[PDB]
Amino acid sequence: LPFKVLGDGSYLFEGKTSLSDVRHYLDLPENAFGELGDEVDTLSGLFLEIKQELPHVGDTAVYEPFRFQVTQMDKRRIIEIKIFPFE
């Protein structure tokens, strides 16, 4: 599985996970990531589409009701994103 379920209600996903697969694993409606999400294929792509800059570890992005944080990178790529708990 491309994700971890954390005890605090948050999730850790591989950055390359498709938005399709994020919606699948988190039981989200089709429009969860909206028009912006329709422009990209992956969770790290959504982060880049929101922030429009090269990423660093520790960066955050919001697409309500979601909040994302880059928790790990290799030398050039986002490899893990935290999705905070959401209502």
What are the structural domain ranges in the chain? Answer: 1-87
Distance CA 86, CA 65 (A): 6
Beta bridge partners of 87: none
Beta bridge partners of 13: 3, 81
Question: Resolution of this PDB entry, in A?
Answer: 1.3
- At 12 the three-state DSSP class reads strand
Distance CA 87, CA 79 (A): 25
Distance CA 78, CA 68 (A): 12
Distance CA 30, CA 72 (A): 27
Pick the CATH number of 1-87 from 2.40.10.10, 3.30.465.10, 3.30.56.10, 3.40.50.300: 3.30.465.10
